[PDB]
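Escalated from tier 1: NAP holo job.
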Amino acid sequence: LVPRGSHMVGLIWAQATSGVIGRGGDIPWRLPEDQAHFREITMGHTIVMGRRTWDSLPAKVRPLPGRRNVVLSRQADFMASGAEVVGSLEEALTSPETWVIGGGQVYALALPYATRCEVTEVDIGLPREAGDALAPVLDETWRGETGEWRFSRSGLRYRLYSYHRS
Ligand SMILES: NC(=O)c1ccc[n+]([C@@H]2O[C@H](COP(=O)([O-])OP(=O)(O)OC[C@H]3O[C@@H](n4cnc5c(N)ncnc54)[C@H](OP(=O)(O)O)[C@@H]3O)[C@@H](O)[C@H]2O)c1
Ligand SMILES: CCc1nc(N)nc(N)c1OCCCOc1ncccc1/C=C/CO
Ligand SMILES: [Cl-]
Ligand code: NA
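Tier 2 regenerated the structure:
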């Protein structure tokens, strides 16, 4: 459970088996099971994203509904209609439960404060290319639960991981 006086920080991302999460300003696959899982985990909570992840959402869909949207930017003139733009994790992590929803820069920024990671891994061979966004690497303070391989309606294998630490 999450006490209302606490500040719990989780990271949620989907990756190829290579660790790639983003390429050319987008996610280089689509997986409906992952979209549903992302919604199930984050609904009702604050979501924090980097400015480039805000840019990657079509204007018509943002801010993502049912969640307080917070965008990290260092640009004093960047504005996100419907959402709050802050310049640091300190300002972004004021809710009792926050999910950092990407991308690569912001996962690495938020990892020192996080105690949970929820990962979808898609079994698509997408090797790391220059400029890709990548999943954060998790050291031995993290302990993980790895689900068995499942099979999507779209014909891709995928599996879920849940990581925790103190
Ligand atoms: N597969 C997934 O789960 C997933 C999830 C989310 C995103 N993505 C993909 O990942 C890519 C985006 O990731 P990315 O690493 O390029 O960018 P990002 O992490 O989404 O955003 C980077 C921006 O965040 C701001 N920022 C970074 N560090 C900051 C700090 N310390 N303080 C304040 N603001 C800070 C900066 O904005 P300013 O430049 O405005 O200062 C920076 O340019 C896209 O391809 C996207 O589609 C994938
Ligand atoms: C559903 C993707 C996803 N999955 C997991 N597991 N964690 C995340 N942090 C995550 O990114 C959410 C922000 C980026 O969203 C999108 N970016 C590009 C194209 C489509 C979307 C989807 C929006 C809502 O379906
Ligand atoms: Cl969503
Ligand atoms: Na996930």
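Residues 38-39, 64 surround chloride ion (ligand 3) (CB under 6 Å).
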